[PDB]
Design a protein around this ligand. Structure first.
Ligand code: LYS
Ligand code: VAL
Ligand code: CA
Ligand code: CA
Ligand code: CA
Ligand code: CA
Ligand code: ZN
Length: 316
């Protein structure tokens, strides 16, 4: 909508207060004009029609329980925008400041979130498996990262290319969580998963096997569930990324860590310069090796660490 830029205040899913960028024209709308062509947050009103209505509020205060998922979808889309812009010099998901659109209150009891090709979509959860999923910065950034992958490598959402697509979203979702730096970790979705259970998460990058996901290529899933295991086999790449950043010894193979910033630079360059829609895990290794070579030199520690990490997870 056309209007004047304003700053509202609200509470997110976990009860934390934050300022949000709004637009005033009769109502205050969840429209942030300060980032590219805008960040726009919508109310799906417990239905499945998308996007629903641009979120309108009478007073620019967003403290109602119903408001919380909207607050966080909006705010964490902004943080994600800022990460890509400030860290990778990327302007929105398409690199040309495309508008970022999110809908909250999708369906009833919906225990998921997704990128639908055009926008982000968040369920409220059923209150047992999940609380509203926009409460997780890693979740928000994971979903927005699918848009980045759509516009870049375009990894096909099936089998190995699909597992890479998922891993890229877990890697950058995690790096955005570290960027914001509020109790960051190498786990996915802990802030919105199972409110009744402390200390769990949907997936772990540091130990994928804690939630039954493979941590070595020899344990890969080759069945048909989950588009050929895209959320399962992602653990193999997630583990490699974790090892590249943090180091460790895994099935007897030692990896010298090079840290998160370098992990992000290597994988951002791989994603945007070398991966293609059909890339498999072996091709990801080559892309990461070439990217690290470009950035740091062929005999560098960074290249050595990329190679050791993929060796450690069985990807040649
Ligand atoms: N995002 C994952 C996990 C959701 C958990 C199941 N409700 C998937 O779509 O497979
Ligand atoms: C729930 C979220 C993290 C994602 N759609 C899965 O995985
Ligand atoms: Ca209000
Ligand atoms: Ca965390
Ligand atoms: Ca996390
Ligand atoms: Ca939990
Ligand atoms: Zn995903």
């Amino acid at each position: 909508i056309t209007g004047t830029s304003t700053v509202g205040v609200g509470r997110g899913v976990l009860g934390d207060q934050k300022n949000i960028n709004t637009t005033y024209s009769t109502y205050y709308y969840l429209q942030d004009n300060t980032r590219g062509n805008g960040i726009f947050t919508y109310d799906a009103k417990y239905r499945t029609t998308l996007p629903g209505s641009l979120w309108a509020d009478a007073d620019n205060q967003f403290f109602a329980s119903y408001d919380a998922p909207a607050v966080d979808a909006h705010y964490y889309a902004g943080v994600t925008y800022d990460y890509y812009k400030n860290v990778h010099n990327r302007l929105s998901y398409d690199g040309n400041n495309a508008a970022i659109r999110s809908s909250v209150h999708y369906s009833q009891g919906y225990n998921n979130a997704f990128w639908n090709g055009s926008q982000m979509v968040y369920g409220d959860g059923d209150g047992q498996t999940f609380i509203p999923l926009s409460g997780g910065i890693d979740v928000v950034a994971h979903e927005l990262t699918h848009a980045v992958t759509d516009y870049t490598a375009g990894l096909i959402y099936q089998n190995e290319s699909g597992a890479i697509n998922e891993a890229i979203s877990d890697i950058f979702g995690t790096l955005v969580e570290f960027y914001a730096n509020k109790n960051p970790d190498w786990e996915i979705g802990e802030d919105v998963y199972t409110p009744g259970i402390s200390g769990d998460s949907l997936r772990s990058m540091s130990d994928p096997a804690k939630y039954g996901d493979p941590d070595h290529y020899s344990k890969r899933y080759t069945g048909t569930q989950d588009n050929g295991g895209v959320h399962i086999n992602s653990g193999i790449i997630n583990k490699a990324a974790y090892l590249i950043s943090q180091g460790g010894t895994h099935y007897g193979v030692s990896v010298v860590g090079i840290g998160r910033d370098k992990l992000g630079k290597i994988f951002y360059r791989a994603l945007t310069q070398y991966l293609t829609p059909t890339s498999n895990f072996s091709q990801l290794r080559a892309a990461a090796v070439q990217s690290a070579t470009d950035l740091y030199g062929s005999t560098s520690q960074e290249v050595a660490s990329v190679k050791q990490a993929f060796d450690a997870v069985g990807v040649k």
